């Protein structure tokens, strides 16, 4: 369902350690789209910034290449 673009943004996670804060708006779109897909994880919702953290398919999505 994801696109390359996607697979650029899943693999970002893991390249800032695992987890990954994004503020909100639409750059958080994406992140929380890959958490329906199953491959973010959003455990701190913070209203500053919501922290994603990579799951089992994020880490087979990063993988992939």
Same mark, same amino acid.
């Given at each position: ?15 800032? &350690? &695992?987890?990954?804060?994004?503020? &909100? +708006? ?6 929380? =789209? ?8 959003? +455990? +701190?919702? =913070? +209203? ?9 398919? &994020? ?7």
């Amino acid at each position: 369902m994801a696109t390359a673009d996607d697979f650029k943004l899943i693999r970002d996670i893991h390249s800032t &350690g &695992g987890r990954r804060q994004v503020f &909100g +708006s639409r750059e958080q779109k994406p992140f929380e =789209d890959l958490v329906d897909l199953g491959w973010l994880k959003r +455990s +701190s919702v =913070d +209203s500053r910034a919501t922290h994603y953290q990579i799951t089992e398919r &994020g880490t087979s999505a990063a993988l992939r290449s």
